[PDB]
Design an enzyme around this catalytic site. Structure first.
Site, PDB file in Angstrom:
ATOM      1  CG  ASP A  35      44.723  24.310  27.211  1.00 22.18           C
ATOM      2  OD1 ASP A  35      44.662  24.943  26.139  1.00 22.18           O
ATOM      3  OD2 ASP A  35      44.075  23.246  27.445  1.00 22.18           O
ATOM      4  CB  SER A 199      41.318  35.025  10.996  1.00 21.36           C
ATOM      5  OG  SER A 199      42.277  35.420  10.031  1.00 21.36           O
TER       6      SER A 199
END
Ligand SMILES: C[C@@H](c1nc(N)nc(N(C)C)n1)N1CCCCCC1
Length: 330
Positions: A35, A199
């Site tokens: 994770d 992004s």
């Protein structure tokens, strides 16, 4: 040193991935959920409340000759999906894919929430976010990656998750046969303890690319792709019959649909998530309403590039002095 381990979907939908991890002496192999969105290595154990264990493999520290109680240490964590676990702490030898760390904090669960109990395939979590998020008290502990880093050939790990198929976590090297083209690296902020990046935009299907900054985290422990409501609405508007359902808990779509792809930007580069990756199947057994793999982050407080996004790429978690993230197509 290096390590290399295969990671395997827990079910036919890729709801999560499990990776075998050797703990203790002799080794006790548990299948952990790696994770990158958290920083505790915790396991089902011989100390876990018996009624809260249902099919998981447990770590038994008393059977490990290298286990040592970390005196006075406790831990307690709560995840974004509302699940939680807590307990005490041992140090022990932990190996992943041939890479060994001695003195790793292994957090032994005394209590786990129902979703953990109900998932027989996940024996615990191995956190790979920054150690500043680790919950051990009163002395915060380091992640497996942080402990290993100085010994690695290169201070990196990579995630290469499969779509409906196994994939690979590598430590200490970049497998140049595992991706196509080049890896585009992008800046990371560690201020919130995550692999947080921005992004450069998105496209829906064959549509034009929208240049827009989307700050979010690369999180292998989250199944889906959570993005701003504007982006998510633009995606689902291209699917006939798709709608956001408050009763179900997100966007659903007719199972008869063919889903469009979704592209996200990494600098000037582009990662394309095929439409099929966005199908999570019926909302309940036998239903013709299917759950979408792109959902709104509104209310979460952060955008999350979970498995739906990451599985479309070869992803480098670069833990150099100034960390960065790399993405390649594959
Ligand atoms: C509908 C269901 C669901 N179905 C499918 N097929 N896949 C999912 N995920 C999360 C992959 N989730 N959950 C929706 C999520 C919030 C409320 C709980 C119920």
């Amino acid at each position: 040193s290096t390590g290399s381990a295969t990671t395997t979907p827990i079910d036919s939908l890729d709801d999560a991935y499990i990776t075998p991890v050797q703990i203790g002496t002799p080794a006790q192999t548990l299948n952990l959920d790696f994770d990158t969105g958290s920083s505790d290595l915790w396991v089902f154990s011989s100390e876990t409340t018996a009624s809260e264990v249902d099919g998981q493999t447990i770590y038994t520290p008393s059977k490990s000759t290298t286990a040592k109680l970390l005196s006075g240490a406790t831990w307690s964590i709560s995840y974004g999906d509302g699940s939680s676990s807590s307990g005490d702490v041992y140090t022990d030898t932990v190996s992943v894919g041939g890479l060994t760390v001695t003195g790793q904090a292994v957090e032994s669960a005394k209590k786990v929430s129902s979703s953990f109990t109900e998932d027989s395939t996940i024996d615990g979590l191995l956190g790979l976010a920054f150690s500043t998020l680790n919950t051990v008290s009163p002395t915060q502990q380091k992640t497996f990656f942080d402990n290993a880093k100085a010994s690695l050939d290169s201070p990196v790990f990579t995630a290469d998750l499969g779509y409906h198929a196994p994939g690979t976590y590598n430590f200490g090297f970049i497998d140049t046969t595992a991706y196509t083209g080049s890896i585009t690296y992008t800046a990371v902020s560690t201020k919130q303890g995550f692999w947080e990046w921005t992004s450069t935009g998105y496209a829906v299907g064959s549509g034009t690319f929208k240049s827009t900054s989307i700050d979010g985290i690369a999180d292998t422990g989250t199944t889906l792709l959570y993005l701003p409501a504007t982006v998510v609405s633009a995606y689902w508007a291209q699917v006939s019959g798709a709608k956001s359902s408050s009763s179900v808990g997100g966007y659903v779509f007719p199972c008869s649909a063919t889903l469009p792809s979704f592209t996200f930007g990494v600098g000037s580069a582009r990662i394309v998530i095929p439409g099929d990756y966005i199908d999570f199947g019926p909302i309940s057994t036998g239903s013709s309403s299917c759950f979408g793999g792109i959902q709104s982050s509104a209310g979460i407080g952060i955008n999350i590039f979970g498995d739906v996004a990451l599985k479309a790429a070869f992803v480098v978690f670069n833990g150099a002095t100034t960390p960065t993230l790399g993405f390649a197509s594959k």
